[PDB]
C-alpha cells in the first residue's frame, strides 16, 4: 500500500552519501564514528572514494596511501563496520574522482588518437629518407599509413609576419593598461576592442587560421578577419564563430577556415559585443570577456573548418564547411593519392613534382586519473575490451580479494562510474574494423580526413567524419559500458553511472541503456560549475531506457562557506525531484580522522560539508533525511509521466536538450514572457559580471536552472535519441511507448539549434519511423509552435499551477501522485488544477509524515482543483487512489563550552558582549516553563510557533519530543504533550559553523579544538543571526 511505504519506507527509498578519504589520512576511530553517524541519520549506504594521497597532503601525516596493505586494512574495517550497521557500499572503478586510470596501464593500453608528421619532397627517386617522427607519448608511437599527396601549390604553408596591435576603444572610462598588448612571448591580451595586424613582405594566401591558446578563451574565437592589399583599404573576410565546446577543450587547437584570401595585411578585429553567455556547451564563455591568444597561425594549405572537433579529438560542434571555403580544387581525389605504406626510412619512386609525405599513426592522448593517490596512472583505452577488463580487475575486483571476501560480497553491492574527464579519443587497434562493420565502408583510404585534409568534396569529407564520430560514440557504449556491465553482473553489483558528455565524443544518452542506475548531478550556489545538462542526460536516459531509480550527486559546492544547513537546501533538492531524480547522494561526506578537530577534514573547502562534525548533524541531518526518504518512497512509485519527447537529432556529439534551447521551437508553450526574458538574456548587453560564490567572477547572464522551474507551464518532456526511436519506440493507442513505462503523445523535431546547426540530415530509417508514428496518431507539431498549449489536439496540461511551483507526476496501479513544491521564500495560497477526473485527492506532508485524506476539492471541466497553502519552500504530495507564550526565566546552556546564562527575553547569540556566546557555533538548550489554562479539548490541536529559528530547533514539552523543526512552518505540534497547569519546555537550538570559524580566525575561538582545512569564508565578514529569536506563540486549531 502507498500509505505503508510513506509511513514505513523501504531501504531503497533512503538517501546515500559520497564518502571521501583525503590524502591517505584515515583512522579506524573515525571510520566507526562516520559509519555510526551515517546510520543515525538514516542513510542507506555510501560510495567510498579515496581522493589524492600523502604527496598531495604531507602535513596530515596520512598512514593509508591507496593500495598499501594499511589502506586495504582500512577498507576491510569499513566493510566490517558497514556490515555491523546494516549499511551498503559502493566503490568507483578507479582511484580518485574519475575515470578509469591506474598505474598498471601502459601508453599502448591507454586512450589513443591519430597523429602525424609531414614533409615536402621533390618527386623522382627517393632512397633511405628519414621522415619526421610524429608525437610519441612517453616514446610510444605506432605507424598506420604513409600517404603521398601532390601539392596544390608550391608556396609555403606559413610565412613570416610582423605582428602589431591597436586599441580602438574610444572613451574616458578605459583602463589603459588593460588595452590590447603583446608580451615578450607574443601572447596577445585585451579587455577592450582592438585589432591585431599581420603584415607579410609579399602577398600571402591564407585559407585558415589556427588559434592556439593558453587554457580556454571564448573571445579568441570571435575575431573578425579583414585583409588589405594596399595597407589602408580593408575588406571583410569572415566573422569567426566559436564552436560549441565543453570545459575540457585544451587538448587541441582550433582551426577556422576562411575563403581563400591573398593579401599583404590581415587584421583580426575583436570586440566583446555580441558575446553569448556561458553554458555547458560554451564553457569558456562562463569567464570574463577578455581576449587572450597564445598564437595565431595563418595557414595556406586547405583544411576543413573546425576539423579538430570533427575528427573526434575533442568534444566540439561546428557548422559544416561552406563550399566557398573548401571547393573542389581544395580537395584531393583518391586517384591522386599514392599509398607508400608497403615500401615504408623510406625508399620508393614518385612522379616529378612536389609531394607532401603524410606519415600517419597513433599514440596515447596523455590522460591520467589525476585526483588519485596510490592508484594514479594512465586512463584505459575506452575501445579496447581487454584494457577495460584489466581496469576492472586491478581496482574494483581487488576489493573482494584483499579485504574479507564474505563480508565484501554482502556489503559491496554497487559499482560506480563517475562523470567523464579524460578527454576524447578517435582511435584504437580495432577502430578500422569496427568502423567497417558499423558504417558499411572502409575508413582507411580516407585517413587524412583525421588531420582535416579535405577529400572529394567538403560535404563528403564531413559525411565521413560524422561517421567517424558516430562510431566513437557507439564504441563507448559497446565496449567500455558493455564490458563494465558484464563485470558488475559477474560480481553481483548494481551499476551506477554519470555522464560522458561534454568531454568524450558520444551520444550523451546512449550509455544509460547499459547501466542499472543513471545518475545526474546538481550543485549548490555554483553557477559556473553546475551541470543542469548532465542532469537532463541522466533523467532522459533513465526515462527512455526504463531505469526506474535515478540517482543524483547533490549539493556539490565550489566554495563552501560554513553557513549551509538543511533549511537552505530544501528548495534546490525539490526542483531536482521535479526534474525526475529519486535517490539523492549527498556530495559530500569527508572522513575526518581526528576525533578532537572540528569541523575537520574537507575536500579543500568544496562542499556540501555533510559530515558528523557538522553542528546540525545529529538532529538536522536526520530530520532532513527523514523528509528525503518519505519523498523518495513516493517518487520511486510506479512510472513517471511525461507527455512530450524531443528528438536529439543526428549530429555528433549530441546529448539531451536544455529547455532554453527549445524556446525558439515552442515559443507558445514557454510563453511570451519567457520568449522576452531569453531575448534580453541572450542579447547579453554589456556582458555583465556576477560574483557567486565569493571569489568566482563569471557571466551574469549564464543560464541558471533555478529560473527554469516548470518551463513548459504544465507539461514535462524527455530528450529522446535515434537509438530509442528505432530500437524501442512503438505506437499504442496514439502514443509513442517504450519499455519500462514511457508514453509520449507529442514528438518534437526541433529547429536547427547551437548543437545541431546544419542541421544534420535525417536518415531514411528515421524519416520512415517518424511517418509511421505520425500515421498512428502521435502529434508531430509544426514549428515554431505558437499556441499556449496542446489542448487543440486533445492534450491538456498535466498540472496547472502559478510560476515558481516545481512539480512532477507519477502513476501506477495504486493511483497517481503529484509532487508540488513552493520555490519561493514566502507563504502562498493558490489553486492547483490536475488532469485527473473523478477521484478523491489526499494531501500527504513529507516533513511530518501526516496524511490528510479529506481535503476540499472541486471538479471543473473534467479536472480536479484544490486550494493549497504552502509555507516558504514547502512541498506536498497530492495522492489519488485508483496567543502569546508567557515564559518564566529561560536557562540557556551552551553545550560546547558549558556556559549557562539566565535571561527573561530571547536574544541573538551573535549580538552578545561575551565572546564565547557571540562567536558560538553549536547547540544551546533553552529551558523554561509556561502555564496552560484549559484541558486540551477533543479534536483540538495546539502548535507552538517558534517564530524565527537560527537555524533549527528540537522541541520537548514535559519531556515528550515534539519534533525537530528545520523548515517552514517553524512550529511543533504539542497537543499530546500539553497538560493543564505548569508545563516544562525545552528547546535545543543549533546554528552553523560560520560564526565560530570567524571567531577562531580572529583569535577568539568560542571553545577549544576548532580546525578545518576549508579556508573559504563569506566575503561579508559579518556574524550570522543565531539562536531562538522568536517570538513564541501558540496556535490553537480544530
- Under the binding rule (CB under 5 A), the answer on residue 421 touching Ca ion is no
- Report the nearest approach of Ca ion to the CB of residue 815 (Å): 36
Question: For residues 909 and 794, what is the distance between their CA atoms, to the nearest angstrom?
Answer: 59
- Report the nearest approach of Ca ion to the CB of residue 245 (Å): 13
- Under the binding rule (CB under 5 A), the answer on residue 840 touching Ca ion is no
Contacts with Ca ion in 718-757 (CB under 5 A)?
Answer: 753-755
Question: For residues 500 and 655, what is the distance between their CA atoms, to the nearest angstrom?
Answer: 9
Nearer to Ca ion, 529 or 622 (CB): 529
Nearer to Ca ion, 408 or 755 (CB): 755
Cβ 253 vs Cβ 212: under 8 Å: yes
Question: For residues 334 and 356, what is the distance between their CA atoms, to the nearest angstrom?
Answer: 15
- Report the nearest approach of Ca ion to the CB of residue 591 (Å): 17
- Report the nearest approach of Ca ion to the CB of residue 647 (Å): 6
- Report the nearest approach of Ca ion to the CB of residue 758 (Å): 9
Question: For residues 247 and 559, what is the distance between their CA atoms, to the nearest angstrom?
Answer: 18
Please return the burial class of 426, using the count of CB atoms within 10 Å of its CB with bins 0-12, 13-18 and 19+: buried
Neighbours of 850 (CB within 10 A): 10
Question: For residues 76 and 832, what is the distance between their CA atoms, to the nearest angstrom?
Answer: 52
Nearer to Ca ion, 451 or 747 (CB): 747
Size of the site for Ca ion (CB under 5 A): 6
Strands 551-556 and 717-720: unpaired
- Report the nearest approach of Ca ion to the CB of residue 103 (Å): 22
Choose the stretch contacting Ca ion; rule: CB under 5 A; options: 623-631, 656-664, 765-773, 1029-1037. 656-664
Place of cell 548532465: 534
Which triple of cell numbers denotes residue 876?
506536498
Cα angle, residue 105 at apex, residues 104 and 107 outer, rounded to 5°: 145
- Report the nearest approach of Ca ion to the CB of residue 539 (Å): 16
Residue 690 φ then ψ, to 5°: -130, 150
Choose the stretch contacting Ca ion; rule: CB under 5 A; options: 189-197, 411-419, 913-921, 924-932. 411-419
C-alpha distance from residue 843 to each of 824, 848, 850, 854 (Å): 20, 12, 8, 8
Place of cell 545541431: 756
Neighbours of 815 (CB within 10 A): 19
Choose the stretch contacting Ca ion; rule: CB under 5 A; options: 333-341, 416-424, 511-519, 775-783. 416-424
Question: For residues 365 and 387, what is the distance between their CA atoms, to the nearest angstrom?
Answer: 15
Please return the burial class of 329, using the count of CB atoms within 10 Å of its CB with bins 0-12, 13-18 and 19+: exposed
Which triple of cell numbers denotes residue 429?
587497434
Nearest to residue 41, comparing CAs of 623, 630, 629? 623
C-alpha distance from residue 36 to each of 30, 141, 142, 264, 533 (Å): 10, 52, 53, 74, 35
Nearer to Ca ion, 224 or 753 (CB): 753
Nearer to Ca ion, 755 or 820 (CB): 755
Choose the stretch contacting Ca ion; rule: CB under 5 A; options: 143-151, 182-190, 655-663, 839-847. 655-663
- Report the nearest approach of Ca ion to the CB of residue 662 (Å): 9
Nearer to Ca ion, 767 or 935 (CB): 767
- Report the nearest approach of Ca ion to the CB of residue 450 (Å): 26
Cβ 899 vs Cβ 916: under 8 Å: yes
- Report the nearest approach of Ca ion to the CB of residue 519 (Å): 8
Cβ 658 vs Cβ 647: under 8 Å: no
Choose the stretch contacting Ca ion; rule: CB under 5 A; options: 444-452, 661-669, 740-748, 873-881. 661-669
- Report the nearest approach of Ca ion to the CB of residue 530 (Å): 13
- Report the nearest approach of Ca ion to the CB of residue 467 (Å): 18
Residue 499 φ then ψ, to 5°: -75, 155
Neighbours of 430 (CB within 10 A): 15
- Report the nearest approach of Ca ion to the CB of residue 755 (Å): 4
Contacts with Ca ion in 336-365 (CB under 5 A)?
Answer: none
Using DSSP, state whether 181 is helix, strand or coil.
strand
- Per the omega criterion (within 30 degrees of 0), is the bond before 441 cis? no
Cα angle, residue 688 at apex, residues 685 and 690 outer, rounded to 5°: 155
Residue 28 φ then ψ, to 5°: -60, -45
Nearer to Ca ion, 169 or 751 (CB): 751
Choose the stretch contacting Ca ion; rule: CB under 5 A; options: 196-204, 215-223, 653-661, 919-927. 653-661
Nearer to Ca ion, 131 or 488 (CB): 488
Contacts with Ca ion in 848-867 (CB under 5 A)?
Answer: none
Strands 735-737 and 730-732: antiparallel
- Report the nearest approach of Ca ion to the CB of residue 665 (Å): 10
Choose the stretch contacting Ca ion; rule: CB under 5 A; options: 119-127, 642-650, 704-712, 869-877. 642-650
Pick from 207, 661, 769, 809: which binds Ca ion (CB under 5 A)?
A: 661
Nearer to Ca ion, 649 or 693 (CB): 649
Contacts with Ca ion in 922-981 (CB under 5 A)?
Answer: none
Nearer to Ca ion, 557 or 951 (CB): 557
- Under the binding rule (CB under 5 A), the answer on residue 649 touching Ca ion is yes
Nearer to Ca ion, 534 or 988 (CB): 534
- Under the binding rule (CB under 5 A), the answer on residue 590 touching Ca ion is no
Cβ 372 vs Cβ 422: under 8 Å: no
Nearer to Ca ion, 374 or 649 (CB): 649
Nearer to Ca ion, 331 or 760 (CB): 760
- Report the nearest approach of Ca ion to the CB of residue 661 (Å): 4
Which triple of cell numbers denotes residue 175?
583602463
Contacts with Ca ion in 752-781 (CB under 5 A)?
Answer: 753-755
Choose the stretch contacting Ca ion; rule: CB under 5 A; options: 137-145, 378-386, 415-423, 778-786. 415-423
Nearer to Ca ion, 636 or 721 (CB): 721
Using DSSP, state whether 720 is helix, strand or coil.
strand
Choose the stretch contacting Ca ion; rule: CB under 5 A; options: 4-12, 414-422, 695-703, 948-956. 414-422
Interaction mask 593-632, Ca ion, x per CB under 5 A:
----------------------------------------
- Report the nearest approach of Ca ion to the CB of residue 3 (Å): 36
- Under the binding rule (CB under 5 A), the answer on residue 418 touching Ca ion is yes
- Provide DSSP, 752-774: PBTTBSSPPPPPHHHHHHHHHHH
E strand segments, 271-374:
291-293, 295-299, 316-317, 338-339, 346-364
Cα angle, residue 433 at apex, residues 428 and 439 outer, rounded to 5°: 110
Question: For residues 1015 and 59, what is the distance between their CA atoms, to the nearest angstrom?
Answer: 15
Place of cell 562516520: 34
Cβ 643 vs Cβ 14: under 8 Å: no
Choose the stretch contacting Ca ion; rule: CB under 5 A; options: 410-418, 803-811, 829-837, 857-865. 410-418
Nearer to Ca ion, 753 or 863 (CB): 753
- Report the nearest approach of Ca ion to the CB of residue 607 (Å): 14
Choose the stretch contacting Ca ion; rule: CB under 5 A; options: 111-119, 353-361, 641-649, 909-917. 641-649
Nearer to Ca ion, 584 or 806 (CB): 584
Nearer to Ca ion, 722 or 956 (CB): 722
Nearer to Ca ion, 296 or 755 (CB): 755
- Report the nearest approach of Ca ion to the CB of residue 678 (Å): 13
Choose the stretch contacting Ca ion; rule: CB under 5 A; options: 107-115, 646-654, 716-724, 938-946. 646-654
Chain residues that interact with Ca ion, rule: CB under 5 A? 418, 649, 661, 753-755
Amino acid at each position: 500500500l502507498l500509505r505503508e511505504q510513506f509511513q514505513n519506507p523501504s531501504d531503497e527509498a533512503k538517501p546515500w552519501t559520497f564518502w571521501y578519504w583525503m590524502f591517505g589520512a584515515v583512522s579506524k576511530e573515525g571510520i566507526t564514528a562516520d559509519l555510526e553517524a551515517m546510520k543515525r541519520a538514516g542513510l542507506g549506504g555510501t560510495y567510498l572514494m579515496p581522493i589524492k594521497g600523502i604527496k598531495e597532503g604531507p602535513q596530515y601525516n596520512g598512514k593509508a596511501q591507496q593500495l598499501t596493505p594499511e589502506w586495504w586494512e582500512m577498507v576491510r574495517f569499513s566493510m566490517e563496520e558497514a556490515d555491523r550497521l546494516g549499511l551498503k557500499l559502493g566503490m568507483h572503478i578507479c582511484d580518485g574522482f574519475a575515470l578509469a586510470g591506474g598505474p598498471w596501464m601502459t601508453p599502448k593500453e591507454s586512450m589513443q588518437k591519430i597523429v602525424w608528421s609531414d614533409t615536402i619532397v621533390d618527386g623522382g627517386k627517393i632512397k633511405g629518407l628519414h621522415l619526421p617522427q610524429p608525437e610519441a607519448y612517453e616514446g610510444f608511437y605506432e605507424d598506420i599509413s604513409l600517404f603521398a599527396l601532390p601539392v596544390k601549390e608550391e608556396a609555403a604553408d606559413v610565412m613570416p609576419a610582423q605582428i602589431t596591435c591597436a586599441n580602438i576603444a574610444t572613451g574616458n572610462h578605459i583602463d589603459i593598461k588593460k588595452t590590447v598588448n603583446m608580451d615578450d612571448a607574443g601572447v596577445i591580451r585585451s579587455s577592450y576592442p582592438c585589432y591585431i595586424q599581420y603584415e607579410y613582405e609579399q602577398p600571402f594566401t591564407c585559407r585558415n587560421i589556427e588559434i592556439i591558446l593558453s587554457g580556454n578563451n571564448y573571445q579568441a574565437h570571435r575575431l573578425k578577419v579583414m585583409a588589405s592589399d594596399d595597407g589602408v583599404n580593408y575588406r571583410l573576410v569572415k566573422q569567426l564563430v566559436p564552436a560549441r565546446q565543453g570545459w575540457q577543450n585544451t587538448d587541441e587547437n582550433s582551426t577556422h577556415a576562411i575563403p581563400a584570401t591573398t593579401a599583404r595585411y590581415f587584421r583580426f578585429y575583436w570586440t566583446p559585443e555580441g558575446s553569448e553567455p556561458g553554458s555547458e556547451d560554451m564553457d569558456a564563455a562562463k569567464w570574463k570577456p577578455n581576449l587572450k591568444i597564445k598564437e595565431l597561425r595563418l595557414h595556406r594549405e586547405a583544411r576543413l573548418d573546425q576539423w579538430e572537433g570533427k575528427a573526434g579529438l575533442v568534444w566540439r560542434v561546428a557548422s559544416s564547411t561552406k563550399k566557398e571555403e573548401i571547393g573542389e580544387q581544395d580537395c584531393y581525389a583518391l586517384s591522386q593519392i599514392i599509398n607508400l605504406t608497403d615500401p615504408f626510412t623510406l625508399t620508393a619512386t614518385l612522379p616529378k613534382g612536389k609531394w607532401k609525405l603524410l606519415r600517419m599513426g597513433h599514440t596515447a592522448t596523455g590522460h591520467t586519473n589525476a585526483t588519485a593517490g596510490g592508484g594514479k596512472g594512465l586512463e584505459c583505452d575506452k575501445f579496447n575490451p581487454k584494457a577495460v577488463r584489466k581496469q576492472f580487475d586491478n581496482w574494483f575486483a581487488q576489493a573482494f580479494v584483499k579485504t574479507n571476501p564474505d563480508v565484501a560480497r554482502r556489503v559491496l553491492k554497487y559499482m560506480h562510474v563517475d562523470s567523464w574527464e579524460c578527454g576524447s579519443q578517435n582511435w584504437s587497434d580495432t577502430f578500422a574494423a569496427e568502423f567497417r562493420k558499423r558504417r558499411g565502408y572502409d575508413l582507411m583510404p580516407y585517413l587524412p580526413l583525421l588531420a582535416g585534409i579535405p577529400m572529394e568534396s567538403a560535404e563528403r569529407s564531413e559525411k565521413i567524419l560524422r561517421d567517424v564520430r558516430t562510431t566513437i560514440g557507439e564504441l563507448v557504449v559497446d565496449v567500455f559500458y558493455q564490458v563494465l556491465a558484464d563485470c558488475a553482473k559477474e560480481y553481483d553489483c548494481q551499476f551506477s553511472a554519470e555522464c560522458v558528455a561534454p568531454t568524450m565524443v558520444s551520444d550523451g544518452l546512449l550509455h544509460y541503456q547499459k547501466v542499472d542506475l543513471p545518475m545526474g548531478e546538481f550543485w549548490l550556489n555554483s553557477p559556473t560549475h553546475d551541470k543542469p545538462n548532465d542532469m537532463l542526460d541522466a533523467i532522459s536516459g533513465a526515462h527512455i531506457y526504463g531505469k526506474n531509480i535515478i540517482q543524483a550527486e547533490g549539493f556539490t559546492e565550489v566554495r563552501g562557506t560554513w553557513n549551509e544547513h538543511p533549511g537552505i537546501l530544501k528548495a534546490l533538492l525539490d526542483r531536482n525531484y521535479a526534474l525526475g531524480i529519486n535517490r539523492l547522494f549527498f556530495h559530500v561526506y569527508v572522513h575526518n580522522p581526528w576525533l578532537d578537530r572540528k569541523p575537520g577534514m574537507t575536500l579543500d573547502g568544496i562542499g556540501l560539508f555533510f559530515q558528523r562534525d557538522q553542528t546540525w548533524w545529529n538532529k538536522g541531518a536526520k530530520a532532513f533525511c527523514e523528509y528525503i526518504t518519505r519523498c523518495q518512497s513516493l517518487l520511486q512509485y510506479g512510472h513517471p509521466v511525461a507527455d512530450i519527447a524531443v528528438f536529439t537529432g543526428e549530429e555528433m556529439p549530441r546529448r539531451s536538450i536544455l529547455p532554453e534551447r527549445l524556446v525558439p521551437s515552442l515559443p507558445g508553450i514557454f510563453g511570451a514572457e519567457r520568449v522576452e526574458s531569453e531575448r534580453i538574456r541572450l542579447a547579453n548587453e554589456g556582458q555583465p559580471l556576477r560574483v557567486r560564490p565569493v571569489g568566482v567572477t563569471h557571466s551574469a547572464n549564464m543560464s541558471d536552472p533555478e529560473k527554469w522551474v516548470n518551463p513548459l507551464r504544465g507539461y514535462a518532456y524527455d530528450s529522446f535519441n535515434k537509438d530509442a526511436l528505432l530500437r524501442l519506440a512503438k505506437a499504442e493507442n496514439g502514443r509513442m511507448t517504450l519499455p519500462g513505462g514511457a508514453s509520449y503523445k507529442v514528438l518534437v523535431l526541433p529547429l536547427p539549434r547551437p548543437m545541431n546547426p546544419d542541421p544534420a540530415a535525417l536518415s531514411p530509417e528515421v524519416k520512415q519511423k517518424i511517418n509511421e508514428l505520425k500515421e498512428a496518431g502521435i502529434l508531430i507539431p509544426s514549428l515554431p509552435y505558437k499556441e499556449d498549449d496542446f489542448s487543440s489536439y486533445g492534450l491538456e496540461r498535466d498540472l496547472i499551477v502559478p510560476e515558481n511551483i516545481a512539480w512532477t507526476h507519477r502513476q501506477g496501479e495504486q493511483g497517481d501522485i503529484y509532487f508540488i513544491a513552493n520555490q519561493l521564500e514566502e507563504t502562498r495560497t493558490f489553486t492547483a488544477s490536475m488532469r485527473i477526473d473523478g477521484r478523491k485527492p489526499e494531501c500527504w506532508n513529507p516533513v511530518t509524515g501526516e496524511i490528510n485524506a479529506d481535503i476540499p476539492y472541486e471538479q471543473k471541466s473534467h479536472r480536479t482543483e484544490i486550494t493549497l497553502t504552502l509555507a516558504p519552500n514547502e512541498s506536498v504530495f497530492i495522492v489519488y487512489p485508483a496567543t502569546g507564550l508567557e515564559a518564566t526565566e529561560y536557562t540557556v546552556t551552551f553545550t560546547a563550552n558549558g556556559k549557562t546564562i539566565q535571561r527573561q527575553e530571547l536574544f541573538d547569540w551573535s549580538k552578545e558582549e561575551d565572546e564565547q556566546i557571540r562567536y558560538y557555533s553549536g547547540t544551546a538548550v533553552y529551558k523554561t516553563t509556561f502555564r496552560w489554562k484549559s484541558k486540551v479539548k477533543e479534536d483540538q490541536q495546539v502548535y507552538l510557533n517558534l517564530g524565527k529559528v537560527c537555524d533549527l530547533a528540537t522541541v520537548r514539552v514535559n519531556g515528550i519530543d515534539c519534533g525537530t523543526i528545520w523548515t517552514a512552518p517553524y512550529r511543533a505540534d504539542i497537543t499530546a504533550a500539553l497538560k493543564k497547569g505548569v508545563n516544562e519546555l525545552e528547546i535545543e537550538v543549533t546554528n552553523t559553523w560560520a560564526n565560530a570559524l570567524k571567531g577562531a580566525d580572529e583569535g577568539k575561538a568560542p571553545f577549544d579544538g576548532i580546525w578545518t582545512n576549508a579556508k573559504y569564508r563569506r566575503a561579508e565578514n559579518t556574524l550570522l543571526p543565531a539562536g531562538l529569536l522568536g517570538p513564541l506563540n501558540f496556535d490553537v486549531a480544530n
